Design an enzyme around this catalytic site. Structure first.
Site, PDB file in Angstrom:
ATOM      1  N   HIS A  41     -10.731  24.230  37.248  1.00  0.00           N
ATOM      2  CA  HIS A  41     -11.066  23.628  35.958  1.00  0.00           C
ATOM      3  C   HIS A  41      -9.823  23.090  35.201  1.00  0.00           C
ATOM      4  O   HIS A  41     -10.004  22.448  34.175  1.00  0.00           O
ATOM      5  CB  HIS A  41     -11.941  24.532  35.064  1.00  0.00           C
ATOM      6  N   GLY A 136      -5.527  30.200  27.357  1.00  0.00           N
ATOM      7  CA  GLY A 136      -4.289  29.992  28.100  1.00  0.00           C
ATOM      8  C   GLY A 136      -4.008  31.058  29.147  1.00  0.00           C
ATOM      9  O   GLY A 136      -3.027  30.955  29.886  1.00  0.00           O
ATOM     10  N   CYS A 138      -6.127  31.746  31.678  1.00  0.00           N
ATOM     11  CA  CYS A 138      -6.746  31.281  32.930  1.00  0.00           C
ATOM     12  C   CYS A 138      -5.702  31.134  34.023  1.00  0.00           C
ATOM     13  O   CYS A 138      -4.631  30.571  33.782  1.00  0.00           O
ATOM     14  CB  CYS A 138      -7.502  29.973  32.712  1.00  0.00           C
TER      15      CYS A 138
END
Ligand SMILES: C[C@@]1(C(=O)Nc2cncc3ccccc23)CNc2ccc(Cl)cc21
Ligand SMILES: [Cl-]
Ligand SMILES: [Cl-]
Lengths: 298, 302
Positions: A41, A136, A138
């Site tokens: 993503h 942030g 991820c």
């Protein structure tokens, strides 16, 4: 003495954390050999279509104050693999392993490719993790250490509406019925990891906390009927066998400890605590308890 | 979202852990630049431990009596000195993995991460707080002596603790990296007891603010309290007095959530009186006191 929620030493994983930026999105990547793994993503959906429009120079990878050059990109399930020109010299001995619910692992929470914290957690039976993640995070990874080998088991992808977290193994396969898109997704009703609660009751006995012990034993059938009633995971013969060493060390048979757990569920703690907790802890596996109460090093 | 007991990444400290052996005793040392720091009781036998004269025992030691092992490499001790309860072993090789570091002495209520080691090898990392009675409730087995407590704020490791001993209650006592014990403890096998432990009130309030930030509001009430009335109630539940310093420190969380400090103090009084009633706060059925106001802001904001 003492029993703490303890994570594996995060050093071998810290040397692999990098920052991955694509367009306006910045998240974390795992740099192993000449590949950087991160949630797909970051390109954000038709991910094959979006990725085909990207070029190597669109991905900015930063390892400390050094920019790595991306020389290739591919997608494996929900993980993006960015081929880089430089092999990570800090690459430890590693494996990609997919874990089962109830298994525990350490999470190295990162922001902008920099490790900020380490915590221990369990893959819930509903396949979510009750983590601690801000925007942030991820690409932050979950791992275990087996001797000197880091087994990467998780990569963080998203936060569900209840504040719980969802992610994939390092092969990009989600844990649970989740997808990596902004859509209505809900964690299923969670259950308690029974074998882990029993392991934690054995840890309390090893630490001198015995008030919950009783003269009674039970059958795996009678116990599982009670476990189902209280949203506890079924206890298999596999779990009983795994608890064997703790049962031998404390002199309390697994079905004897099961009768203690059965009473704790039907009657509560009665103002008492076990290892400083008023709730039954289920995020220590039988192996975590042995490792902590015997002193295994990495 | 989410609230976890979180330790600092232990990498910068792992690169400093070494094994120190003197005679029959083996424990851990902290290798920074060309010095290895470790508990001075490594020079004792179990017989010396009741009333050891460490100046006398150390004067009888030579550099070759201390065996320091960093991984599979033996370091050569070229000098030794004692600073309070810490032994400093000068070595002939500076640790190339030495991070940017400081020695900081902390106050009760402060939190830190502990890297538990055995034979100079890190085995686990956990989060601790210095209890008001100056002990730490750690998880330590025999051989963990010399394991260190630290904070990694920014890129500098602040070493605040070195493990020295376990008290009869299973709680642990140790020193700062200057060898000064936290608490009225001595590095002797003489009868020592931790004082009655108390709950770190400012930390519980910080944790109640973390729960409000995370959407938990059930424990909030329409009441406020004077600081003195709060302390008269809290003292009765073995809670530490809350000072004006603590109220000031909670200021940013009070501004972020819109709940005045003395207003959250009234929620805490009610929780102490009623209990939880089957409810949990941030997944806990007890009031958590090992998150400082600084930890809460770092975790809930970055
Ligand atoms: C070396 C020793 C000690 O407390 N070790 C341990 C330290 N931490 C945890 C443990 C658990 C189980 C047994 C021992 C443990 C022995 N008595 C003593 C007395 C004084 C000092 Cl400064 C150090 C020690
Ligand atoms: Cl002294
Ligand atoms: Cl402090």
């Amino acid at each position: 003495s003492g029993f703490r929620k303890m994570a594996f030493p995060s050093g071998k994983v810290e040397g692999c954390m990098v920052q991955v930026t694509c367009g306006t999105t910045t998240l974390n990547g795992l740099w192993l050999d000449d590949v950087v793994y991160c949630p797909r993503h970051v390109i954000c959906p038709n991910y094959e279509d979006l990725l085909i429009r990207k070029s190597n120079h669109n991905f900015l990878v930063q390892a400390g104050n050094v920019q790595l050059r991306v020389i290739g990109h591919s997608m494996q399930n929900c993980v993006l693999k960015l081929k880089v020109d430089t092999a990570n010299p800090k690459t430890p001995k590693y494996k990609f392993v997919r874990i089962q619910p109830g298994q525990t692992f350490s999470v190295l929470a990162c922001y902008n490719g920099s490790p900020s914290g380490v915590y221990q957690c369990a893959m819930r039976p509903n396949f979510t993790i009750k983590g601690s993640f801000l925007n942030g995070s991820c690409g932050s990874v979950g791992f275990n250490i087996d001797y000197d080998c880091v087994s990467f088991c998780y990569m963080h992808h998203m936060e569900l509406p209840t504040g719980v977290h969802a992610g994939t193994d390092l092969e990009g396969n989600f844990y649970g019925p989740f997808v990596d898109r902004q859509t209505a997704q809900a964690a299923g009703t969670d259950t308690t990891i029974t074998v882990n609660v029993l392991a934690w009751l054995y840890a309390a006995v090893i630490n001198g906390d015995r008030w919950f012990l009783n003269r009674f034993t039970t059958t795996l059938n009678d116990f599982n009927l009670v476990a189902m009633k209280y949203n506890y995971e079924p206890l298999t013969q596999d779990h009983v066998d795994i608890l064997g060493p703790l049962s031998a060390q404390t002199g309390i048979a697994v079905l004897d400890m099961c009768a203690s757990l059965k009473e704790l569920l039907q009657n509560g703690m009665n103002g008492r605590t076990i290892l400083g907790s008023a709730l039954l802890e289920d995020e220590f596996t039988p192996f975590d308890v042995v490792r902590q109460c015997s002193g295994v090093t990495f």
